[PDB]
Write a protein that binds this ligand. Structure first.
Ligand SMILES: CC(C)CC(=O)SCCNC(=O)CCNC(=O)[C@H](O)C(C)(C)COP(=O)(O)OP(=O)(O)OC[C@H]1O[C@@H](n2cnc3c(N)ncnc32)[C@H](O)[C@@H]1OP(=O)(O)O
Ligand SMILES: CC(C)CC(=O)SCCNC(=O)CCNC(=O)[C@H](O)C(C)(C)COP(=O)(O)OP(=O)(O)OC[C@H]1O[C@@H](n2cnc3c(N)ncnc32)[C@H](O)[C@@H]1OP(=O)(O)O
Ligand SMILES: [Cl-]
Ligand SMILES: [Cl-]
Ligand SMILES: [Cl-]
Ligand SMILES: [Cl-]
Ligand code: NI
Lengths: 184, 184
């Protein structure tokens, strides 16, 4: 219900961009009037804030919640990569893309909160790289270098991947997992 | 003399973005009137075109021209990664960012000309991944997945790396090379 307003405004802000869209174009795209929409939402910046928070809820529901308890740290990184790739290459890519593109559009207060949620994921990856090196499950590497290589590989996917293409997202996930986390 | 206009305008277009930077603004950052600037550049999108080609020229002079003849295909990928990482982390970080952020700004022949130079790099990486797989120098992997994992790791650096930080760019290059192209 109320999520339908976020998920529809995410489509416009994504294809057309944040600046290109106004609160009026989103009211039209909804069954509400320019007045009705402003009753559910404070302003435009807070609408963007709600979209990004919704995107992190989906990320944590489909990725972090499901892998953060995996005992073996490299098995935890492999699973995290698969879940994160599948999130990027399917329907919820709308809210994920807005988080990356519109990162700089937020105000100071709201960017601090969203980034706090992003930083928990980065710290999750770094900890897993650290544990995996100590236990001899991956070739040693600085945890920060490993985390941002992980994220660079995965999140770059939305720039080139086409679902009608030669390979499925599942085949891509297998390739990246085996290349960054091979048997060791 | 002419690079001054491109370097200066790239700083603006990089910080303020393409839209939000006008010919009037650039004509001021450079000590000129609006017309004196037009004496050496056609229009705004031509300025963007020249900036992107300048950035691809720098990339080819510092990266591709120096590594494309390396015989061993995995040694070729390692060197290519090192050179590309150092390009992302140093004085020419402005032009490369514009090539990525403004990738969809151009259209027509100019767009196609830039995208052809970009596609030449991807195809270079894909060919080297293929050769290294057949020759048993890297763990087998689809060349397209290897190429865009390469590019994701390397180009994502502009979003987090700070030169005043804990690690140097050379240390980051060492870690990334060891992860993607270890002894095999
Ligand atoms: C110095 C440095 C900044 C130089 C550069 O800019 S290098 C390129 C950096 N930018 C990127 O990597 C962003 C993603 N890459 C691209 O968009 C392309 O490589 C560009 C050369 C920019 C051209 O864009 P575009 O015409 O839209 O290309 P496409 O969207 O058609 O696809 C690009 C390649 O990905 C492939 N692809 C897409 N989906 C799949 C799939 N499901 N399975 C297997 N392959 C797939 C697609 O076939 C294409 O590879 P090619 O076969 O054309 O070599
Ligand atoms: C659904 C999914 C997409 C969820 C996500 O969004 S995951 C994150 C995706 N975005 C990115 O990866 C972009 C790059 N990452 C970041 O910018 C940060 O992780 C963010 C949390 C997003 C923003 O944090 P922010 O407050 O802006 O801090 P910075 O922008 O300055 O990022 C610098 C952090 O990376 C590290 N770093 C930077 N330079 C170096 C260096 N020379 N040597 C070693 N480490 C370095 C450094 O650790 C820093 O993090 P801190 O230790 O300062 O907390
Ligand atoms: Cl899984
Ligand atoms: Cl799982
Ligand atoms: Cl970000
Ligand atoms: Cl691009
Ligand atoms: Ni799973």
């Amino acid at each position: 219900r109320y999520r339908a307003i976020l998920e529809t405004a995410a489509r416009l802000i994504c294809d057309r961009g944040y600046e290109g869209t106004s609160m009026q174009e989103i009211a039209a795209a909804c069954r509400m009037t320019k007045a009705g929409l402003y009753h559910h939402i404070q302003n435009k910046e807070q609408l963007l804030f709600a979209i990004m928070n919704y995107g992190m809820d989906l990320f944590e529901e489909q990725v972090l919640s499901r892998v953060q308890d995996i005992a073996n740290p490299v098995e935890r990184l492999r699973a995290c990569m698969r879940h994160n790739i599948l999130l990027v290459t399917r329907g919820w890519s709308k809210e994920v893309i807005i988080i990356l593109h519109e990162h700089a559009t937020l105000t100071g207060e709201t960017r601090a909160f969203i980034d706090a949620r992003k930083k928990k994921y980065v710290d999750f990856l770094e900890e897993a790289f650290s544990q995996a090196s100590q236990q001899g499950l991956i070739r040693p590497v600085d945890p920060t270098v490993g985390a941002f290589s992980f994220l660079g590989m995965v999140l770059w996917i939305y720039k080139w991947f086409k679902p009608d293409g030669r390979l499925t997202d599942e085949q891509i996930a297998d390739g990246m997992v085996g290349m960054l986390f091979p048997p060791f």
